[PDB]
Amino acid sequence: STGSATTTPIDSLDDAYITPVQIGTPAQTLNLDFDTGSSDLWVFSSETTASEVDGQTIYTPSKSTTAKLLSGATWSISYGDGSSSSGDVYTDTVSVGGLTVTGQAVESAKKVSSSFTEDSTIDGLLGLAFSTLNTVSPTQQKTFFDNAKASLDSPVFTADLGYHAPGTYNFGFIDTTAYTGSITYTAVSTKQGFWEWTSTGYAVGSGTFKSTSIDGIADTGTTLLYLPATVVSAYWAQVSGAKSSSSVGGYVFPCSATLPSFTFGVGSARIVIPGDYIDFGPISTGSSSCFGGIQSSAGIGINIFGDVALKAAFVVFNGATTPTLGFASK
Numbered sequence: 001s002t003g004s005a006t007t008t009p010i011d012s013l014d015d016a017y018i019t020p021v022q023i024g025t026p027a028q029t030l031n032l033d034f035d036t037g038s039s040d041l042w043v044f045s046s047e048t049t050a051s052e053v054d055g056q057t058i059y060t061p062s063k064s065t066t067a068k069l070l071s072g073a074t075w076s077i078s079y080g081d082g083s084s085s086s087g088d089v090y091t092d093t094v095s096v097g098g099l100t101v102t103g104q105a106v107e108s109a110k111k112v113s114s115s116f117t118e119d120s121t122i123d124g125l126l127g128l129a130f131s132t133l134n135t136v137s138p139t140q141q142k143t144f145f146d147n148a149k150a151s152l153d154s155p156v157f158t159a160d161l162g163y164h165a166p167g168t169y170n171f172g173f174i175d176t177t178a179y180t181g182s183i184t185y186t187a188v189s190t191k192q193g194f195w196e197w198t199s200t201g202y203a204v205g206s207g208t209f210k211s212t213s214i215d216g217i218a219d220t221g222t223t224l225l226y227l228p229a230t231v232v233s234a235y236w237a238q239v240s241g242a243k244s245s246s247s248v249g250g251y252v253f254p255c256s257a258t259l260p261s262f263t264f265g266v267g268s269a270r271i272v273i274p275g276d277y278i279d280f281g282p283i284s285t286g287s288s289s290c291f292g293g294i295q296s297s298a299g300i301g302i303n304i305f306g307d308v309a310l311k312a313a314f315v316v317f318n319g320a321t322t323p324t325l326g327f328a329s330k
């Protein structure tokens, strides 16, 4: 089997991407944030504290003839950015772009933190990291991909995120028309539960490539590119007037600037992020100071290849016996 679904930016900045997902019988379609940096499929629901719902579409398990309460199971997740959610668990039929999993754990939110409430466009998360990170207790549950994998034509999914435009998540096949050149595969460590890999270096604009190992995670659920302070300083030094602002929380730059590209290495291959991808617009409405799309990972404890990086590539998440990651230009 295979599946293919379009993923759409939630706003004009590509702050996140949403993908429609069918849950239950008859289908209830929710727009979920596909997140390769977490492993819970959770949704706003009829159980969510009323004051914490503000425009989201909700899953109502009582209206699904295939929903079954998973007795005694609860979940609670705290994301790296400080947001959180928790609740109980159903199993139900879940379909993405034509690919169906029966008995998928659908985690129903009873509580969500303010950032989730304040974002009306995201109805929940669909985790695509390794199932070892799943938070359901006392019996850990599998991700959608883990459940589907055996049925797929090939045990893979691909992320093809657009810049200020829709893109695609495919399951079970590689669309050879969706990229240029070849796909370069690189090793993955699954020890921490993430798609963790090692970039071979970087370049700023037309500058020379610096060969250096940068360990990080491929994370579709993170907006920006977080890299070591040395690398980030080298990038912003090329932008007149750019500075790190403690009050704003990162590098900012004049909105009048034309930004240089940023290249990252995948083995001997190179992925080029155009300068425009690195502009995240005014720091506050009407300001002429703009927020940078490349930021320091110092303090995070890990480098994060988020959407800024991933959207410059066609990315293969290879879930074979030994997982790997593939990157192609597009």
Ligand SMILES: N[C@@H](C(=O)N/N=C/c1ccc(O)c2ccccc12)c1ccccc1
Residues within 6 Å of the ligand: 033, 035, 037, 038, 039, 077, 078, 079, 080, 081, 082, 083, 125, 133, 221, 222, 223
């Ligand atoms: N901006 C990311 C983020 O902060 N991810 N953090 C993931 C994470 C970090 C550290 C952990 O220890 C985890 C453990 C299990 C699952 C996820 C995580 C994000 C993704 C989806 C929703 C909110 C926020």
